[PDB]
Design an enzyme around this catalytic site. Structure first.
Site, PDB file in Angstrom:
ATOM      1  N   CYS E  16       0.830  -1.040   0.016  1.00 46.86           N
ATOM      2  CA  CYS E  16      -0.022   0.093  -0.064  1.00 46.86           C
ATOM      3  C   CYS E  16       0.811   1.252  -0.050  1.00 46.86           C
ATOM      4  O   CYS E  16       1.758   1.494   0.870  1.00 46.86           O
ATOM      5  CB  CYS E  16      -0.912  -0.121   1.312  1.00 46.86           C
ATOM      6  SG  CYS E  16      -1.783   1.562   1.498  1.00 46.86           S
ATOM      7  N   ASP E  23      -0.670  -5.190   1.267  1.00 46.61           N
ATOM      8  CA  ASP E  23      -2.123  -5.071   1.208  1.00 46.61           C
ATOM      9  C   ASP E  23      -2.394  -6.393   0.387  1.00 46.61           C
ATOM     10  O   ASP E  23      -2.038  -6.475  -1.079  1.00 46.61           O
ATOM     11  CB  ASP E  23      -2.004  -3.920   0.220  1.00 46.61           C
ATOM     12  CG  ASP E  23      -3.361  -3.117  -0.027  1.00 46.61           C
ATOM     13  OD1 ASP E  23      -4.250  -3.535   0.538  1.00 46.61           O
ATOM     14  OD2 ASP E  23      -3.475  -1.925  -0.805  1.00 46.61           O
TER      15      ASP E  23
END
Lengths: 100, 101, 99, 101, 103, 101, 101, 100, 100, 102
Positions: E16, E23
C-alpha cells in the site's frame, strides 16, 4: 484507464430520530468511475459523518448518494443501507443513472 | 429524490384454517417508494394484525399488499410469505405494478 | 385476488426402474395461479403418488407438471426434480411458458 | 415429452500433462433436450473416460461438449470444469448454441 | 477449438503506497480465449509480480488487465481485485470488450 | 468385525393426535453395533411405520428407540426427532445404554 | 518428529451388493501418526480399490481401517464413511485405539 | 421410559424499560424431563406472556427458567435469550441443575 | 498481562517434492503466550519462508511449530496445515505442550 | 437471581501503532454475573473508547478485560478480539477466572 466499476462496503452508525439511540448499519456503494476514483479515506469520512447525527436511514442512503456524486460525479451510483429495527430487517437503496 | 427501493423482512404468526393451529411465517415486502417511506412501526403493526387471525397464507400475502398500498401507495410492491406446512416449504407472492429488475 | 406466484418444495420417492430400489428426490414447483391455488394437501398427494412407481426422474418432472396443469390449470408452471444417482447430481426441469 | 432443461454435476479426474500427476475436477453440464435425454449412465462413462488420460482441463471441457453434442445433439449445451492448480481456482466453460437457433 | 470462457481466481499481495505495508488481495480474472489460452503458470507469475510493489489496487486491476490483454489478446477480459482497507471491503473491476449482443 | 458407531438420518411423518393433520419430522439415530448392523431397508420400514399413526413426537422417539433395541440390541442407542410445531422448533432425544463384551 | 494428528477426506465409489449399481461415498480418516505418515497417493489407491467392488459401506469402513492399520500402524485411527441410500443418510464409523480427549 | 432431553426454540417480544420500545428475541430452552414433559402450547404461552411486558432480557431469561421449573421441575434446565440492542448482539443464559 | 490465547490463520504455499509443483495451503497457529506475543509481521515472514521450498505439508507443520517455539517459547502451541492434493483434503496437526 | 452467563458481541475500531491506519475488529465478551450486570450502553462505550486509539489488539483484549472486571467484578470473564491484518486472520483472547471446580 480508470476502473469500470468500484464496490465499497463498510459499517456505520447514526442516531435514530425516534428512539434517539444509536442505530448501526451496513452500507454498500457501487459506482462507475468517470475519470476519478473516490479515495477510500474520503468514503470512510462520508460514512463516519453520520455518527451522532439524528437521521433516518432512508435519507442517509440518499444523502450519501449525493455526497458521492458531488465528490466524483459518476454516471452511475447505487447506495444500499442495511439495518435492523424492532425485529425487522430493512434495506434502503438509492440509485442514480439506472433505468429512467 | 426518494429511495429507489425498500425491502423489509420480518417473522409473523397467523392461525391456519386447515390445521386449526398457529402457523409461523417469514414475510418480505419490497417496494418502490413515492413520497413517504412506510414507518417500521407501522409495518410491524400490519404483520402483527394477523396474530390470532384465521387466514390462509395466500390471502395474507394479498391482504398485506393491499395494506401497504393503502398506507404509502407505491407504484410497485411485492409481498412474499414463506412458511413450512406438512413437510412442504411454501412461498406465496403478491405483487402490484411494473417489474423492477 | 390470486397471488401472482406460488413456490412449493418438498421431498419424495419413486422406484428406479432398472434396480427396483427406492429413489429419493427433492421437487420444486413454481406456478402462476389463475384464480385457483393448489392446496398443499393435494400437492403432497401428487408427490406421494410416486412412491412404489417405477419412473425415471426425467419423466416424473413432466408427469408432475401435467398433474398440476390438470388440477389448477395455471398459465405458467415449472417443475424441478433433483436427485443423486451413481455419484451424479441431477436436476431435471419441466416447464410450460415464460416469466 | 422431454424435460425443458437438464443439469448434471459430478466429480472426475484426469492426468496433468505437466507433472504426470492426478488432476481432480468437478464438471457440470447443462443442456436443453431436443427429443433425446442423455442417460446418466452414459454421462458418467463420458466423465470416467478421462481417468488416466493426459489432457488439459481447457481441452477436456471442449472434448466433453463435443461428446454430448454427438450423443444427443441439443440446441444448447454448456460444460463447466472446475479445478485447483498451483493455488488458482480455475473454471473452464465450453458452450454451444442457444434458443432460438 | 478453445473454451468459451475461462475464470481464474487466486490470492495476491502488493504494498500500500500510503502506509508502506502489505496489501493483501483476492483477484478474479475472466476472459474469452481467441486461439490462445493463458497458461495458469503465466497467470500466477503476473499476479505474484506485484509482491513488494507499491501500487494502489485501483491501478493493479487495470495493470493486470493490460497484462492479460497483451499475453492473449482476448475479445473480453474482466479483472476484479478485492481487498480490505481501513474497515472497508473494496472491489475494483477493470473490463475490456465483451460479447457483442446475441443478435 | 463390526463398525464402532452408526448414524442414520431420514424424514418421516406421523399424525398429530390433537389436530389429526400430518406431522412431518426429521429423525436421527445413533447406535453402537453389537455384532449386528441394522439394515437400512429395515430402519426405513420402522420410520415409515408412523405414517398415518396418531402419536406425539415424544412418544415416537421412545417407540423407535425400542424398535431399534428389539431389532439389533445395541449397547447404546440415541434417537432424536425434530419437528416444527406452532412456531417452536422442537427436538426430543431418547437414549438407552447397557454393557459391552 | 511426526505430526500429532492427520485427517484425510475424499470421495470414492463401490458397488452396492443389493442393487448392483455404483454407490458413491465420502470418507474421512483421522489418525495419530507413530513415526510414519500415510502417503496421500497410498490413501487414494486404498479408496479407489473399492471401485467396481461389491461391498456394503459398513464393511468398507472396517476394511479401510484395516488397510490404514497395516500401512502405517497408528495408535489411534477413525474411518467414517457417509453415503445416501433409499432416502436415508448413513454414516458408519470404524475406530481403533484409545480415543482423543 | 420417557425422553432424556428436550430442546425448544422460538421467537418472542418484550418491552425495553429504558426505551419503551419493542425488544424482539430468540429463546432456546433445553431440559431433562423427570416425570413431566412441558406441553408445547404451554411453553409457547410462557414465551408469549412477555409480549407488552416491560422487562429487561436478563430478567426474562431468569423469569422463564423459574416458570419451567415451577411447571415441570426438571433436574436440569437451561434458558438462552438472544437479542440485539444498539449494535450489540446479546445472549443471556440462565441455567439450573445438572451434574457437572 | 499477556493474552491467554492467540490464533493466527493465513494462506501460503510450498513446493511439493512428489509433483515438483507449487502446493497452496491454509495454516492456523494457536498458542498460549508467555511474556511474548509473536508479531504478525514475523508470523507472515515464517509462513512466506515456505514459498519455493521443497517440503511435505507434514514436515511443514512440524517446522513451523519449531519456529514459533524458537521465537516466543509458548508453553502450548498448535499448528494445523490444510491443503487439497489429488482430490484429497488433508489436515496435518503438530502440537507441543498438551497431554504427552 | 442473576443470569448464569452473558455474551456480548459488537464491532469496533482502533488504530494500528505500526501502520498508523484504522483497523476494524469484532469483539466478544463473555462473563458470569455476580450481582451486577454490565449495562449494554456501558459495554458499547468501553468498545467505542478505542476508536482513534493507537493500541495493539493484544493489548486491547487485556485492557477491555480489565475494564469489565473493574466495572462489575465477575468471577469469570473472557474477551475475544478478532481482526484481519496483512492477510492474517487474528484472534486474541484474554480470560480471567472461571467456574471453581468441584
Amino acid at each position: 484507464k480508470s476502473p469500470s466499476l468500484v464496490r465499497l462496503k463498510t459499517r456505520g452508525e447514526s442516531v435514530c430520530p425516534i428512539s434517539k439511540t444509536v442505530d448501526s448499519f451496513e452500507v454498500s456503494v457501487e459506482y462507475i468511475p468517470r475519470g476519478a476514483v473516490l479515495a477510500i479515506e474520503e468514503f470512510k469520512k462520508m460514512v463516519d459523518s453520520y455518527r451522532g447525527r439524528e437521521i433516518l436511514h432512508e435519507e442517509l442512503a440518499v444523502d450519501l448518494l449525493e455526497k458521492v456524486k458531488a465528490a466524483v460525479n459518476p454516471p452511475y451510483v447505487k447506495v444500499t443501507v442495511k439495518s435492523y429495527y424492532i425485529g425487522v430487517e430493512v434495506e434502503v437503496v438509492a440509485e442514480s443513472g439506472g433505468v429512467p
